[PDB]
Amino acid sequence: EDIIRNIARHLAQMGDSMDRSWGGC
Amino acid sequence: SASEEQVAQDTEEVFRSYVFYRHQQEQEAPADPEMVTQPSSTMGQVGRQLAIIGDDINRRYDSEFQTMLQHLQPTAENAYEYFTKIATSLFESGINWGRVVALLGFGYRLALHVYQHGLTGFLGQVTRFVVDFMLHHSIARWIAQRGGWVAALNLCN
Ligand SMILES: [Cu+2]
């Protein structure tokens, strides 16, 4: 339960950082 | 909807190509033989593009995910549950292309971790986790509303 939340939080952080770093080609 | 269903049927080829190109690029920087095995299909190009553009930020989190997955101890019996709960919590806030690539990356990291810990022949089961979750939790629908998986070919950096 605690590990699931930690992993999901890291995936959201990494995904939001990736989303901010990307633009159109 | 019909568009949701086409996108959900394309996810398997996207994830398989993403796994191939991600593993190949990390090896070129112990190999998983299940990951080393049409490349010019639009869905194969999408998986490769998403492996490429996530590389720099994925590398920053490598150590964290290694530690967390060791603690989680996924097995053949609990991996569906852990994958589903993790992916559900990821998307509770919302969806954007970065989080979709984070989901594919989590399927890659989970498949690689269990293989390295002695769970062989599991990559097809992780692929099904990813495909089914995207269909049943509205991710394929969001992607269809962007124009399908091909919209990811227009993501850069
Ligand atoms: Cu952290």
Residue numbers in the entry:
A (entry chain B): 80 to 104
B (entry chain A): 21 to 49, 55 to 62, 66 to 185
Q: Which sentences from the paper describe this structure?
A:
BAK is dormant in healthy cells. Its apo structure exhibits a stable globular conformation incapable of executing poration.
To stabilize and structurally characterize directly activated BAK complexes, we rationally designed BID-like BH3 peptides that bind BAK with high affinity compared to WT BID BH3. Based on activity and binding profiles of monosubstituted peptides, we produced disubstituted M(3)W(5) BID-like BH3 peptide, which exhibits ~30-fold higher binding affinity for BAK compared to WT BID BH3, judged by ITC and SPR. To reveal the structural basis of direct BAK activation we determined the crystal structure of activated covalent complex M(3)W(5) BID BH3GGC-G184C tevBAK [M(3)W(5) BID BH3-BAK] disulfide tethered as BAK BH3-BAK complex. We observed two similar complexes in the asymmetric unit, and both exhibit destabilized helix α1 electrostatic network in the protein core as observed in the BAK BH3-BAK complex (electron density shown in Supplementary Fig. 9a). Directly activated BAK exhibits 2 hydrogen bonds between α1 R42 and α2 N86. We validated BAK destabilization upon direct activation by determining Tm values of apo BAK and the M(3)W(5) BID BH3-BAK complex ± DTT. The reduced complex (15 µM, 95% peptide occupancy estimated from KD) is significantly destabilized compared to apo BAK or the covalent complex (15 µM, 100% peptide occupancy based on the crystal structure). In contrast, the cavities in activated BAK BH3-BAK and inactivated W(3)W(5) BID BH3-BAK complexes are more modest in size (64–70 Å3) whereas activated M(3)W(5) BID BH3-BAK complex exhibits no cavity at the activation groove. Our new structures (10 asymmetric unit BAK BH3-BAK complexes and 2 asymmetric unit M(3)W(5) BID BH3-BAK complexes) capture destabilization of helix α1 contacts to consolidate this mechanism as the basis of BAK activation by BH3 ligands.
